[PDB]
Design a protein around this ligand. Structure first.
Ligand SMILES: Nc1ncnc2c1ncn2[C@@H]1O[C@H](COP(=O)(O)OP(=O)(O)NP(=O)(O)O)[C@@H](O)[C@H]1O
Ligand SMILES: Nc1ncnc2c1ncn2[C@@H]1O[C@H](COP(=O)(O)OP(=O)(O)NP(=O)(O)O)[C@@H](O)[C@H]1O
Lengths: 294, 294
């Protein structure tokens, strides 16, 4: 029983936007497209998610839940909903994240990712998480697959539909054992997320079947130290994996730590060639969602 | 082919009651009055509807249909028929709803209506609707104009003569396009009804001519978010407007949701001054219809 969520839900007209090409398919198909607000001579690159041509009282009810959340947030590192279209099949309109999920991006670009990028991503992701924590919101599926890339310099947390006010391999123990989820178990997944980024996109516990994890983590085992990782960075990952959730670090601390490290990247991440890394129709009225306010 | 409708139709003697003053005029004139059952030393405030001094095989046949329905219902949030008088012109006798239609009442009283009232009205109306749904009855003209106010604390659904076992602006799409009406399209009008109450009595799509609606609603457009409405309440309105009728919510759910909200009104409706709102011949033998049983 807290404050009134006065966020506005913008309903869009089927015509206000147009699909351009499929982006990926799950049980919803996402398209890349443009949106032209009522009468504004502005064009906005967006992503249009459309429940499969189906319409099951359950599928239709989930996408809406997701819409409720996305609309109730506003932070530079969290995907915000732009609006929805109530057509035969419901469509969610979000900002276009050109480079896709961070997971694929580190894989597709290992050879060009430097410590600065990596560390800034950790900072950015932690900021978004801290934001959700302020809004007393518990993302319950934080992973490299759910971080989208607007630009190599700017990522944003997404996919927090399943979020509250399965990926057992990213789950804290309390969650796995007693379906308990707090901002702190979010930290645990943050740890694994970070771990994916440092291993340039590896699979956590690849091999070990979901069934074993609970026991494993109970023994005292964890994900290994990624090669590029100084003991400083690894230490932090480990702390996020303490069995005792209150003994794990707080996102605002995680921000503070990774920022410190972000000021002298080569001291905390050792990457061969770090120093030489480098990362990337009338479009006159194009404006990125981030500049299309209220 | 279901159960036998054993409701009793009470025929009243012209003399058993007396008109007091006109209440409003349509093609039937309604008077405010009193009814004194045969020999009972009880006086009942009532409303007497009398077909215009005319008597056309069609007009006379409609009022009777209405009587059939009203007599076949019994719920605290549905106007029940008290009896009818077979005089030169037929007269329907219903319980007096002192404060009139809810539509006028929110208009005439904006400045004194708080979230608690609003939300309880949504609950009450939904209860009456769920009742009709149980009696497999489809009100086919649910709107703020057809909800009467017994007291600011107690409203009742009415005007379901046109009901089955035009207001295009309150109509679901299936109704507008293929004259299809289910309890679910009732939900759609429920949505608009609610929407009128939150906009303190506004006209849905004011401006847009009846001709456009069908197409509009098809594009994906809807009624806007009323100012006092948190995204939670608005969300529900929207769900009632899904093109797919089975993906809209069920009155018993609508009851459940609005009740939850009714327990902490200020969290779902933001109204300036909500906290300081306030709403309202020998009459020794007066008894409200609701206490005059069987
Ligand atoms: N805003 C976006 N911009 C660009 N690509 C996106 C965007 N949102 C999703 N995608 C990608 O489109 C494909 C489908 O995404 P999506 O519909 O979210 O399925 P999902 O993430 O596997 N499960 P879910 O999010 O619950 O539907 C994946 O490659 C997503 O990473
Ligand atoms: N039971 C009642 N108590 C007080 N006012 C009523 C009652 N019933 C109707 N009225 C009002 O009397 C006026 C005429 O109502 P009514 O005869 O129902 O016309 P209508 O609702 O416009 N169309 P209809 O109901 O089909 O005849 C309107 O202001 C009604 O809201």
């Amino acid at each position: 029983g807290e404050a009134p969520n006065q966020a506005l839900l913008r309903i869009l007209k089927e015509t206000e936007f147009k699909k351009i090409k499929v982006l990926g398919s799950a049980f919803g198909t996402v398209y890349k497209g443009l949106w032209i607000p009522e009468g504004e001579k502005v064009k906005i690159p967006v992503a249009i998610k459309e429940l499969r041509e189906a319409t099951s009282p359950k599928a239709n009810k989930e996408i809406l839940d997701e819409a409720y959340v996305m609309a109730s947030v506003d932070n530079p590192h969290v995907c915000r909903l732009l609006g929805i279209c109530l057509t035969s099949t419901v469509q969610l309109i979000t900002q276009l994240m050109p480079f896709g999920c961070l997971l694929d991006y580190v894989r597709e670009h290992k050879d060009n990712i430097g410590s600065q990028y990596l560390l800034n991503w950790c900072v950015q992701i932690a900021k978004g998480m801290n934001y959700l924590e302020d809004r007393r919101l518990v993302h319950r599926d934080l992973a490299a697959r759910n971080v989208l890339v607007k630009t190599p310099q700017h990522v944003k947390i997404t996919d927090f539909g399943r979020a509250k006010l399965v990926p057992i391999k990213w789950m804290a123990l309390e969650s796995i054992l007693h379906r308990i989820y707090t901002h702190q178990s979010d930290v645990w997944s943050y740890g694994v997320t970070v771990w994916e980024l440092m291993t340039f996109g590896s699979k956590p516990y690849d091999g070990i079947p979901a069934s074993e994890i609970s026991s494993i983590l109970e023994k005292g085992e964890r994900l290994p130290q990624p090669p590029i990782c100084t003991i400083d960075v690894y230490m932090i990952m480990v702390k996020c994996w303490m069995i005792d959730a209150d003994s794990r670090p707080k996102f605002r601390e995680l921000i503070i730590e990774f920022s410190k490290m972000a000021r002298d990247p080569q001291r905390y991440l050792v990457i061969q060639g770090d120093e030489r890394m480098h990362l990337p129709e009338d479009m006159d009225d194009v404006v990125d969602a981030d500049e299309y306010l209220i």
